[PDB]
């Protein structure tokens, strides 16, 4: 159920930040979300193919301030 086992875990795990129940909301909010949705990318094939787990995207340092939604 929604990737997770019907959100039994309850540890707020998602591509963005929230639970799998709120995963569609999270996906809608940022769109990129570790390039979970392939369709988002212009070339279709994104740099990060893998579904974001725990801060998988932007692993190398980009900005000093760590904000999940950073462009
Ligand atoms: Zn997500």
Curated annotation (Swiss-Prot):
Residues annotated to bind RNA: 26, 50-54
Region annotation (Acidic) ranges: 41-65
Modified residues (Phosphotyrosine): 45
Phosphothreonine: residues carrying this PTM: 51
UniProt modification remark: Phosphorylated.
Residues spanning the membrane: none
Zinc finger intervals, unnamed: 14-26
Assembly description: Interacts with host RAN; the complex L-RAN recruits cellular kinases responsible for the L-induced nucleocytoplasmic trafficking inhibition. The complex L-RAN can further bind to the host exportins XPO1/CRM1 and CSE1L/CAS. Interacts with the protein 2A.
Function: Forms a complex with host RAN and probably binds to exportins carrying activated MAPK in order to mediate the hyperphosphorylation of host Phe/Gly containing nuclear pore proteins (Nups) resulting in cessation of active nucleocytoplasmic transport. Proteins with NLS signals fail to import, cellular mRNAs fail to export, and some proteins small enough for diffusion are not retained anymore (efflux). The resulting inhibition of cellular protein synthesis serves to ensure maximal viral gene expression and to evade host immune response.
Protein name (record): Leader protein
Organism from which the protein derives: Mengo encephalomyocarditis virus
């Amino acid at each position: 159920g929604s990737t997770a086992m019907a959100t039994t875990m309850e540890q707020e795990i998602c591509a963005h930040s929230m639970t799998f129940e709120e995963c569609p909301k999270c996906s809608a909010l940022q769109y990129r979300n570790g390039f979970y949705l392939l369709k988002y990318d212009e070339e279709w094939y994104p740099e990060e193919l893998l579904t974001d787990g725990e801060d998988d995207v932007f692993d190398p340092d980009l900005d000093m301030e760590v904000v999940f939604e950073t462009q």
